[PDB]
């Protein structure tokens, strides 16, 4: 049971029961499924993303600032904030991606087009193919920094 990467978990020092995906780092209160077998994964997918660079990205620079100085910690803080804000319904992925993504793909509301495996940085790729159409990732780390991924196709 439960699609690839999912497992029921619980918060430490707390009792909240939630479902976590080890591949996408995504969290949610709703059970990820309610049968299909040998389905596998998509041969190709289309995703959008929001990148938050920190002082340790392979390129600590973006169209937002010539020199990124924030730390990973601070970058993760910014990420969780955007996710929380997206999940609450106070903001939409597209608008936050266009405003605060350090990836030049911001001009296209964070849209990266379609790609297959072997095209994106491994950790990014792995999350992308573990997502189902319409699902958003949790904090995903790469050399570029930390991302939030939304699969659209």
Q: Is the distance from CB of 48 to CB of 111 less than 8 angstroms?
A: yes
The phi, psi pair for 122, rounded to 5°, reads: -35, -55
Do residues 116 and 82 lie in contact, with contact meaning Cβ atoms separated by under 8 Å? no
Q: Which residue numbers are catalytic?
A: 49, 103, 121, 144, 147
Q: Of all helices (H) and strands (E), which one includes residue 98?
A: helix 93-100
CA dist 121 and 4 (Å) reads 20
Helix axes 93-100, 72-88, angle to 10 degrees: 150
**The Cα angle at residue 126 between residues 123 and 132, in degrees rounded to 5:** 135
Q: Which tokens sit at 70?
A: 């924030």
123/36 Cα distance (integer angstroms): 26
Indicate which technique resolved this structure.
X-ray
* Closest of 122, 86, 114, 90 to residue 101, by C-alpha: 86
133 Cβ neighbours under 8 A, 6+ residues apart: 151, 152, 153
The span from the CA of 40 to the CA of 17, in Å, is: 27
Q: Using H for helix, E for strand and C for coil, what is the string for 2-55? A: CCCCEEEEECCCCCCEEEEECCCCCEECCCCCCCCCCCCCCCCEEEEEEEECCC
| DSSP summary character for residue 119 | S
* Burial class of 17 by CB neighbour count within 10 A (0 to 12, 13 to 18, 19+): exposed
Q: Which two tokens stand for residue 26?
A: 């995504």
Say if residues 141 and 79 touch (Cβ distance below 8 Å): no
Q: How far apart are CA 34 and CA 61, in angstroms?
A: 44
* Separation of alpha carbons 55 and 57, rounded Å: 6
**Is residue 101 classed as helix, strand or coil in its secondary structure?**
coil
| Domains annotated on the chain, with CATH | 1-32 (2.20.70.10), 44-153 (3.10.50.40)
Q: Minimal CA–CA distance to 3: which of 23, 78, 11? A: 23
DSSP 151: E
* CA 147/CA 11 separation, integer angstroms: 23
Phi, psi angles (nearest 5°) of residue 9: -135, -175
- The residue count for the chain: 153
């Amino acid at each position: 049971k439960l699609p690839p990467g999912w497992e029921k978990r619980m918060s430490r020092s707390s009792g909240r029961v939630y479902y976590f995906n080890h591949i996408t780092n995504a969290s949610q209160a709703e059970r990820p499924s309610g049968g299909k077998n040998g389905q596998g994964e998509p041969a190709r997918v289309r995703c959008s993303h929001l990148l938050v660079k920190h002082s340790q990205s392979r390129r600590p620079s973006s169209w937002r600032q010539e020199k990124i100085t924030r730390t990973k910690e601070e970058a993760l803080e910014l990420i969780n904030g955007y996710i929380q804000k997206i999940k609450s319904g106070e903001e939409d992925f597209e608008s936050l991606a266009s405003q605060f993504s350090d990836c030049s793909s911001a001009k296209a509301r964070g849209d990266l087009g379609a790609f297959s495996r072997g095209q994106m940085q491994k950790p990014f790729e792995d999350a992308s193919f573990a997502l189902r159409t319409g699902e958003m990732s949790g904090p995903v780390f790469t050399d570029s920094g930390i991302h939030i991924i939304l699969r659209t196709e």
